């Protein structure tokens, strides 16, 4: 009944365009930049990226991990604060109320989440800059209204092979069952907390249920986005396939399927983390529920 990893916490900025994760590469835009270096492979006019793209994105990623590493002192502050609210035995050692200690969790949690953003603010402009350098680089293609779609649909074929490698329904019925068994106990404690006069364990259960909710909606959020990614590129394969498009439409294309794939890789990374986090939180509530029903004397 102790949480050793709090990587499930995340925050997006006021743009709602940048979602910061504790897992590498912290920005889904990094995966999109990796996919563009595979786009410049097939085009002879912009093969210079393979040298200029790697030197640019690698420093953005290295600064992204540097930014999140600064908040480690604040990361451990709430990692040790939820270990007190989760464990009644560890809570019975300190000498402060549950509400007074719960406000320390909330205040220091926002400090940790807010730190992840403030340290990455100057990186938010660096992503916009590389996006521009990617768009302007595509202007060097020796086409105007005759740009070739061959490489555009080659990546579509490869992406749907990579997307079937993940079992979507395995994640879908997992969270549906865990959410059904989550609200079960939420609507349950509220109906039995008055029969058993025990405030130490039930307060710890409601808190571990509060974080269980947050982790769940983070799972359903990333689950939809990888579902939306898979459905959209599938329709691109089942849709019209012209041989020639304007140079601006091709830039729309690479940015479309490039972002579609980065959301898939970013979601699949956090979905597996949230899975291991949900089961760990559920193991805590299950055993502190057994202590509530195991001592009827």
């Amino acid at each position: 009944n102790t949480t050793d990893n709090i990587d499930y916490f995340d925050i997006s900025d006021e743009s709602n365009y940048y979602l910061i994760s504790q897992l590498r590469p912290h920005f889904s835009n990094i995966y999109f930049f990796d996919e563009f270096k595979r786009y410049a492979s097939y085009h002879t006019e912009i093969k210079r990226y393979e040298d200029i793209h790697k030197t640019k994105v690698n420093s953005l990623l290295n600064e992204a991990s540097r930014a999140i590493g600064i908040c480690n002192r604040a990361k451990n502050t709430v990692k040790g604060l939820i270990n007190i609210l989760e464990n009644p035995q560890k809570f019975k050692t300190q000498r402060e109320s549950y509400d007074v200690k719960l406000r320390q969790y909330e205040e220091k949690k926002e400090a940790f989440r807010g730190c992840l953003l403030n340290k990455n603010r100057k990186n938010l402009d660096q992503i916009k800059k590389i996006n521009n350098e990617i768009r302007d680089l595509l202007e060097k293609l020796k086409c105007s209204q005759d740009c070739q779609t061959n490489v555009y649909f080659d990546m579509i074929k490869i992406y749907l092979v990579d997307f079937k490698k993940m079992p979507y329904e395995n994640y879908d019925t997992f969270i549906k069952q865990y959410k059904n068994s989550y609200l079960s106990g939420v609507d349950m404690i509220r109906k039995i907390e008055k029969q058993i006069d025990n405030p130490v364990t039930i307060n710890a259960i409601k808190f571990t249920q509060k974080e269980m909710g947050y982790i769940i909606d983070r799972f359903e959020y990333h689950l939809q986005k990888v579902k939306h990614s898979i459905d959209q590129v599938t329709a691109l394969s089942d849709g019209v396939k012209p041989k020639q498009v304007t140079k601006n439409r091709l830039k729309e294309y690479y940015f479309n399927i490039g972002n579609y794939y980065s959301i898939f890789k970013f979601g699949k990374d956090s979905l597996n983390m949230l899975n291991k986090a949900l089961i760990h939180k559920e193991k805590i509530v299950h055993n502190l529920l057994g202590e509530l029903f195991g001592h009827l004397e």
Partner: antibody
Amino acid sequence: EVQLVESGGGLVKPGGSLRLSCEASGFLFSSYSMNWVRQAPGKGLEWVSSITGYSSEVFYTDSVKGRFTVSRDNSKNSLYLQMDSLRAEDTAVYYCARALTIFGVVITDYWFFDLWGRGTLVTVSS
Amino acid sequence: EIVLTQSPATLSLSPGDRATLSCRASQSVTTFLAWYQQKPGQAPRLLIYDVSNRATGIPARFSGSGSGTDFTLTISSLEPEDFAVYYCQQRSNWGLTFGGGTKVEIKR
């Protein structure tokens, strides 16, 4: 309403210094780059300097390099231009301009100017 | 500095005519050129970004063309409002430079 309101213009002798302000409202100031464009009386547009969304990078025109400085306070939705060691050729109407940013599948911008302010007059003469 | 020359320095046409203004650059700026419009006592107004893309809200009569060094702003049929000064501007290389601007005026 979306607007840019300049401030702090005036008059100073050669070698003096002034600080121009610009208060934006109607949009999220942090997501846009900002610029300063000046126009001499009866003459054309000259770009002065630019700053990115979160002060990650700043740029200047050669004529003011080493004399001017740009800063922004996203908490106060404010853009600043510190003009030190002013010269006669600095007499112009200074404009606060917003960089044209596009919100599509990703955020991208151009080094053009889609939003302007009324501007303030800066006169430098002995 | 990448200078932008805009000759003819001024045009004298009437409503209904077609104004075709030019902007030539010293170095090549690819297609990273913009067009502005400025009336007396007002701020400039963005018309076109990256040669041929119209800004939001401005009428469709404004067209854009050109690549490399020679560029063209085209007004299909002028309106009483369109009479003002038009500046070109490049964003390719640092030291952002404007053109000399050319004023279109009513012919009488």
